[PDB]
Design a protein around this nucleic acid. Structure first.
Length: 196
DNA sequence: CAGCTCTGTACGTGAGCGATGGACAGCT
DNA sequence: AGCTGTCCATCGCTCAGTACAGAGCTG
């Protein structure tokens, strides 16, 4: 990577971008190598996240990874990951690491209490749900989940991973429906608030 | 049996690498 | 004309979670 070794990138981490009063926190799986290299969220040239963000109207212009620190203030969006360690890919991670991350995640969510905790990836919500709600469903579905983060009013919303690894949703276009519904949910919650 | 859970197989786009070689201009 | 090098268009290839069958388990 411009002359920087994998071995070096393995040791890097990607900072959280979290604040109070967010509408959405996007929870990724863990940093991949390019994220680790850049120090910004979703830099992968083929990752769908920033495309979908724009295509859905969650951003009104096309942003990119370098804009990540602006999201909280301008767009009501922050970022973290279930697991902090950089890996060549998601199956390098162990169950213990995922469960550690889950515990840490829930404490962060309890602290910052966004309106919506967005799991960028079904696999990390499968783990979080078992660990946190004790629920392992036959057929976990995407979209809104029927549980709040414990002790909070923060909702849990699941999307297919923005990674272009999954074949079932081969293009950004095939994921954008979930981003549009996420936008709808945010707008509904703000409506309820305005009207109490 | 029947419902779990656990493990390994199989899967579509599009971005960007290195390799390759066609177009072309500078020089003789 | 003939030779030679750069530029750049293009190619082939690689590669960035999810669904599900079946084996194992256990009530």
């Amino acid at each position: 990577f411009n002359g920087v070794s994998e071995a070096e990138l393995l040791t890097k981490t990607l900072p959280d971008i979290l604040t109070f009063n967010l509408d959405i926190v996007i929870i990724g799986i863990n940093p991949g190598l390019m994220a680790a290299y850049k120090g910004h969220h979703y830099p992968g040239p083929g990752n769908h996240f920033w495309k979908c963000l724009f295509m859905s109207g969650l951003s009104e212009v096309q942003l990119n990874h370098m804009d990540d620190h602006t999201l909280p203030g301008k767009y009501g969006i922050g970022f973290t990951n279930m697991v902090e360690r950089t890996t060549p890919g998601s199956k390098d991670l162990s169950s213990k690491e995922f469960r550690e991350g889950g515990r840490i995640l829930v404490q962060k969510l309890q602290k910052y209490q966004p309106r919506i905790a967005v799991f960028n990836g079904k696999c990390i919500y499968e783990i979080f749900s078992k660990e946190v709600f004790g629920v392992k469903v036959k057929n976990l579905e995407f979209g809104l989940q029927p549980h709040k983060i414990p002790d909070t009013e923060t909702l849990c919303y699941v999307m297919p991973s923005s990674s272009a690894r999954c074949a079932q949703f081969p293009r950004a276009q095939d994921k954008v429906h979930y981003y549009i519904k996420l936008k709808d949910l945010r707008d509904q919650l703000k409506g309820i608030e305005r009207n109490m």
